[PDB]
Amino acid sequence: SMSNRLIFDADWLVPEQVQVAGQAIQYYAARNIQYVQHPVAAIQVLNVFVPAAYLHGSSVNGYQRATAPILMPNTVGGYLPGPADDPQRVTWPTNAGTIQQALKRGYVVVAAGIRGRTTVDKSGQRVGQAPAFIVDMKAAIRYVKYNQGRLPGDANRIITNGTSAGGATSALAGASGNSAYFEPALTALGAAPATDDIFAVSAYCPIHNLEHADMAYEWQFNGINDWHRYVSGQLTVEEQALSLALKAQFSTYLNQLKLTASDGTHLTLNEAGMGSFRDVVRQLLISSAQTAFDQGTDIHKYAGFVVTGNQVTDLDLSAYLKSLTRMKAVPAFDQLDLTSPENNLFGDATAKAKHFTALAQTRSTVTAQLADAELIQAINPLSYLTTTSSQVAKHWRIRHGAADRDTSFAIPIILAIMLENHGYGIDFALPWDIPHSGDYDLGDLFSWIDGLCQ
Numbered sequence: 001s002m003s004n005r006l007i008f009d010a011d012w013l014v015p016e017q018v019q020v021a022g023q024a025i026q027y028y029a030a031r032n033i034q035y036v037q038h039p040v041a042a043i044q045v046l047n048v049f050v051p052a053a054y055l056h057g058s059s060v061n062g063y064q065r066a067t068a069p070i071l072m073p074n075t076v077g078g079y080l081p082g083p084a085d086d087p088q089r090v091t092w093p094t095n096a097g098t099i100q101q102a103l104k105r106g107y108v109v110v111a112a113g114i115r116g117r118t119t120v121d122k123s124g125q126r127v128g129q130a131p132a133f134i135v136d137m138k139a140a141i142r143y144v145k146y147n148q149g150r151l152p153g154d155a156n157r158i159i160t161n162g163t164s165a166g167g168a169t170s171a172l173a174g175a176s177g178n179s180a181y182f183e184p185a186l187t188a189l190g191a192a193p194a195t196d197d198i199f200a201v202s203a204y205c206p207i208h209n210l211e212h213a214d215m216a217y218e219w220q221f222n223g224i225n226d227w228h229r230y231v232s233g234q235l236t237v238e239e240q241a242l243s244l245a246l247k248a249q250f251s252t253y254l255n256q257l258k259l260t261a262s263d264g265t266h267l268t269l270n271e272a273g274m275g276s277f278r279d280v281v282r283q284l285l286i287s288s289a290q291t292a293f294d295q296g297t298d299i300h301k302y303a304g305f306v307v308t309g310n311q312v313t314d315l316d317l318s319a320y321l322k323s324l325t326r327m328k329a330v331p332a333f334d335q336l337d338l339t340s341p342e343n344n345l346f347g348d349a350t351a352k353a354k355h356f357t358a359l360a361q362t363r364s365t366v367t368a369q370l371a372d373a374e375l376i377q378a379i380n381p382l383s384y385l386t387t388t389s390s391q392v393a394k395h396w397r398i399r400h401g402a403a404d405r406d407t408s409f410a411i412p413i414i415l416a417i418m419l420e421n422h423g424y425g426i427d428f429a430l431p432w433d434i435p436h437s438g439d440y441d442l443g444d445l446f447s448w449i450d451g452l453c454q
């Protein structure tokens with residue numbers, strides 16, 4: 001209620017310790033802080049974790065109570081609800097290991113609980129579909145920033161982190177700082193009166209750009225007709241038909257983005273999906289393989305790589321993709337029968353699911369409505385990156401595994417290039433033979449974070 005003043009009190013922080021493989025990490029914890037005045041669901045609380053040194057007027061890794069980065073990791077995947085995380089958490093989903101390590105590194109951690117597509121209110125009504133996920137994320141950020149003087153850590157040093165849909169969440173938070181679109185929702189919730197722009201973005205396999213993900217997925221995977229996920233199926237003739245068309249539309253969609261390489265060239269595709277853009281994707285995968293190759297990895301686990309001497313000199317992209325195989329059916333995101341996580345994400349309190357593309361709406365196999373166009377745009381990070389603003393984070397780190405079939409490589413790549421083209425800081429890679437996952441590279445994420453702030 002309005003009785004909740006959203007004022008953090010450091011006296012709430014209580015001492016805890018966790019074993020970190022070979023070390024005891026000392027920290028303080030304050031849990032279950034209601035970060036808005038009018039929450040609609042029990043999941044909307046946040047946890048705060050602070051390196052113990054900061055309660056003692058002491059230091060960690062060059063950081064102190066006033067200056068420490070604030071890592072804001074989330075637990076969201078598949079656009080499902082993400083519970084407030086905890087270094088003591090053993091229940092799925094959780095990044096407790098990442099949190100333990102962040103604390104060891106001197107970062108303040110604010111782990112906020114986030115509504116998702118299956119979330120219901122006290123009346124059994126759905127309250128977690130779009131744009132619930134990002135509203136909650138923003139509200140948590142506002143709580144932190146409103147509480148700058150009282151919450152340990154520098155509120156101007158907030159760095160979000162997430163994997164998959166959580167990566168999209170992290171990316172959207174960075175792109176959309178202080179967007180007016182979300183104001184009515186944040187006001188209806190009674191969020192803290194503060195800004196929600198952040199300092200830096202960490203994103204693993206962000207599942208974003210949903211309205212173009214079907215085109216990208218088929219551009220990558222057309223010609224490979226069996227799919228295998230969690231079960232192993234084969235594409236029907238209808239799906240093969242939709243696939244070939246979806247692939248072609250991607251070229252049109254890609255060319256008009258006017259993406260540029262470092263030399264300033266327009267990155268493009270022809271009617272067959274071949275061209276300088278495809279070449280860029282290939283080079284990032286070659287680069288990925290070389291790094292792995294240099295470490296003594298057997299890259300011929302997958303097909304297509306050409307090795308000359310000690311160098312990966314080329315790659316048969318089609319052979320590689322064939323060996324990697326195919327995870328999702330067609331369309332991969334906007335299912336004609338509305339059965340995808342994203343369909344459900346775009347539903348609302350009346351409709352369990354909606355389409356989010358004209359093609360899938362036109363070809364729907366069930367009665368359906370199309371999601372509001374403004375909403376689709378609003379939850380796409382690219383929407384905010386057509387320009388250089390203050391509200392967009394300056395620093396980005398994006399990772400998508402080179403063995404990851406949850407979305408086309410083109411999706412995170414487009415994001416990275418757009419960020420580069422519009423002058424934002426962007427650190428991008430496709431780490432070799434990494435599955436659907438995140439936080440497997442903390443030494444590098446933390447060195448990157450330290451690089452921005454020290």
Ligand SMILES: [Hg+2]
Pocket residue numbers: 204205400401404405406435436437
């Ligand atoms: Hg992934």
Ligand SMILES: [Hg+2]
Pocket residue numbers: 063067068069453454
């Ligand atoms: Hg700093």
